[PDB]
Amino acid sequence: EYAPLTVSVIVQDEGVDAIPVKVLNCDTISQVKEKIIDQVYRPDSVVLEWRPSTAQILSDLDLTSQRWKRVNTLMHYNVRDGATLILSKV
Amino acid sequence: EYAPLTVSVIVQDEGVDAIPVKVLNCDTISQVKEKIIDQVYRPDSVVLEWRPSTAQILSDLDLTSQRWKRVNTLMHYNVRDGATLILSKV
Numbered sequence: 001e002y003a004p005l006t007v008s009v010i011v012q013d014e015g016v017d018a019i020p021v022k023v024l025n026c027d028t029i030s031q032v033k034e035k036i037i038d039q040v041y042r043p044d045s046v047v048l049e050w051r052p053s054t055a056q057i058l059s060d061l062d063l064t065s066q067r068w069k070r071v072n073t074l075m076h077y078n079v080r081d082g083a084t085l086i087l088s089k090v
Numbered sequence: 091e092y093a094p095l096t097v098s099v100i101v102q103d104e105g106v107d108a109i110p111v112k113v114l115n116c117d118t119i120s121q122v123k124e125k126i127i128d129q130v131y132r133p134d135s136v137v138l139e140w141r142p143s144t145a146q147i148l149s150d151l152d153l154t155s156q157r158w159k160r161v162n163t164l165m166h167y168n169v170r171d172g173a174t175l176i177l178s179k180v
């Protein structure tokens with residue numbers, strides 16, 4: 001099943017408040033990044049991280065991808081409603 | 091709004107019947123291709139085409155992409171419920 005969820009986005013080293021972003025569990029990471037950018041600034045240059053003790057970079061295709069490698073969604077990483085994400089540029 | 095739809099997949103030059111595949115309008119092309127491959131054979135090596143007079147290759151990122159370029163979904167191309175798609179390899 002596909003369903004909406006909200007993530008809380010921290011813009012790294014900017015000292016600003018976390019920004020809520022409405023995303024879908026079936027959104028690929030690139031779709032998540034586009035929704036974040038649209039919201040925050042109302043994808044190749046930006047990095048998205050999550051800390052479920054060890055910080056993890058979220059990407060469409062990485063070494064964790066379902067294995068031919070299947071595109072990662074928030075559902076793949078098991079990112080749940082309310083999760084904190086970190087956005088950084090360059 | 092996000093919603094399901096079924097596409098009818100023709101496996102090019104194999105002389106076989108069209109295969110129905112359940113997809114989502116918010117599925118990127120790579121997500122669509124994965125669902126097609128899972129169904130047909132129960133993404134980089136496969137090509138997906140649609141004929142709304144002129145045949146068009148469907149891809150995550152192409153020259154038609156929303157312009158930084160946003161990832162294509164079936165919703166982007168305006169592929170509706172029942173649409174015929176053509177799958178070819180190499």
Ligand code: NA
Nearest residue numbers: 026027116117
């Ligand atoms: Na999606």
